[PDB]
Amino acid sequence: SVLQVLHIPDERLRKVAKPVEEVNAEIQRIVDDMFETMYAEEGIGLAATQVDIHQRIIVIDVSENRDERLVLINPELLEKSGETGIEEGCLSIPEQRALVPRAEKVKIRALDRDGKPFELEADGLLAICIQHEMDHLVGKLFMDYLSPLKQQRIRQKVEKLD
Numbered sequence: 001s002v003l004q005v006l007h008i009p010d011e012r013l014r015k016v017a018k019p020v021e022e023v024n025a026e027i028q029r030i031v032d033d034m035f036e037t038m039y040a041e042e043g044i045g046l047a048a049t050q051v052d053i054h055q056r057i058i059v060i061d062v063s064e065n066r067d068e069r070l071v072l073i074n075p076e077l078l079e080k081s082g083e084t085g086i087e088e089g090c091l092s093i094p095e096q097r098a099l100v101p102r103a104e105k106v107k108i109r110a111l112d113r114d115g116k117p118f119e120l121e122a123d124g125l126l127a128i129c130i131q132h133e134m135d136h137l138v139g140k141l142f143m144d145y146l147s148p149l150k151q152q153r154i155r156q157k158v159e160k161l162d
Ligand code: NI
Pocket: 089, 090, 091, 092, 132, 136
């Protein structure tokens, strides 16, 4: 099933996800529906918060083939270093891109789509992407990293579209 993706201004994008309790069949339907939604919208990552489910679930695909499935349930940043940043975009902030500061390298743990934990050391577009998506789970969007000015210009340009 494809899910609607919430757009700013929506208070539901500001909600703080509670952790996933038991990884099960029902949690697995959410996952595949998020993958379906993420590809359908040609996005490289998605957080349950954006589809208005408020649990700590994240699906990602940073491959250029669009065939490498990565799932982060209840993720937890253990280490990080450096700074990086690229032009980021967001399915929930339609057609707005800006550069945002990020840690270069991240090291997270999380449970996978079967409920089994894994540790992951990341850099490049994955590190940027893990950070961007975990921000969604705690009510934070990437435009928050910018002067109030650019933040108003961004909401204005998103009013019009929708
Ligand atoms: Ni986003």
